[PDB]
């Protein structure tokens, strides 16, 4: 979780030095740590070693890789997992779909990203808050001001109070098109924000109010 790959490697070596065969869950944590540090080579070694010791990967293991690949935009490796999930008897859950959108987005495949969101709704499922944030980053990245607006107000149309990440993406799409009117409109929303403290501080510090020694 914290991305301490060095400590994770020492745990695995300590277990092996004591003739202890680590569990399938224990390796998945090691695979998680390497993906946090973008060490794909060492992550796939641990994935390979799981089959060697008989600790076959679980569904969570195929998610540690997908999120690790999603951050780097390695949709070629993401499709390998997806093509492996179908024949492994694992149906595509919502978490798998989020990583696919995130991987395609970071890889620059905007058309294939929205298609996954288009094909996701056909297969029913239930998009969560991150899925809306996953598809919002796609439209924000490809400078879609009107599409982002329709994505944003629907986030609050269900009384969800979108997180600070979605707010920062709105400032990007407005700042990319130099729409200084909408930037000031959204900043005032973050300035009051009586419910959430993180928006207020981050919104205030964007304008430069908190750029002092004591105010930092």
């Amino acid at each position: 979780k914290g991305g301490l790959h060095e400590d994770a490697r020492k745990i695995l070596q300590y277990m092996t030095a004591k003739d202890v065969v680590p569990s399938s869950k224990a390796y998945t944590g090691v695979i998680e740590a390497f993906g946090q540090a973008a060490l794909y080579e060492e992550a796939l070694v641990a994935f390979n070693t799981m089959h060697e010791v008989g600790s076959n990967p679980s569904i969570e293991t195929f998610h540690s890789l997908l999120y690790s690949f999603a951050r780097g935009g390695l949709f070629k490796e993401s499709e390998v997992i997806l093509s492996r999930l179908v024949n492994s008897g694992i149906p595509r859950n919502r978490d798998t779909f989020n990583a696919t959108i995130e991987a395609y987005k970071q890889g620059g495949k905007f058309e294939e990203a929205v298609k996954t969101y288009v094909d996701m709704e056909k297969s029913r499922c239930d998009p969560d808050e991150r899925t809306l944030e996953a598809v919002l980053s796609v439209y924000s990245c490809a400078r879609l001001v009107d599409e982002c607006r329709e994505q944003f107000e629907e986030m609050k149309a269900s009384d969800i109070l979108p997180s600070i990440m979605c707010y920062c993406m709105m400032l990007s799409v407005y700042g990319k098109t130099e729409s200084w009117d909408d930037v000031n409109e959204l900043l005032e929303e973050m300035l009051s924000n009586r419910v959430s403290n993180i928006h207020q501080v981050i919104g205030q510090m964007i304008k430069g109010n908190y750029d002092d020694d004591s105010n930092w």
Binding site: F47, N48, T49, H51, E52, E77, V80
Partner: peptide, 17 residues
């Protein structure tokens, strides 16, 4: 006569591709 003189590494370690 005929009785004389007593008569897996490299597996699960492939390229992910």
């Amino acid at each position: 006569g005929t009785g004389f003189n007593k008569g897996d590494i490299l597996f699960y370690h492939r390229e992910f591709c």
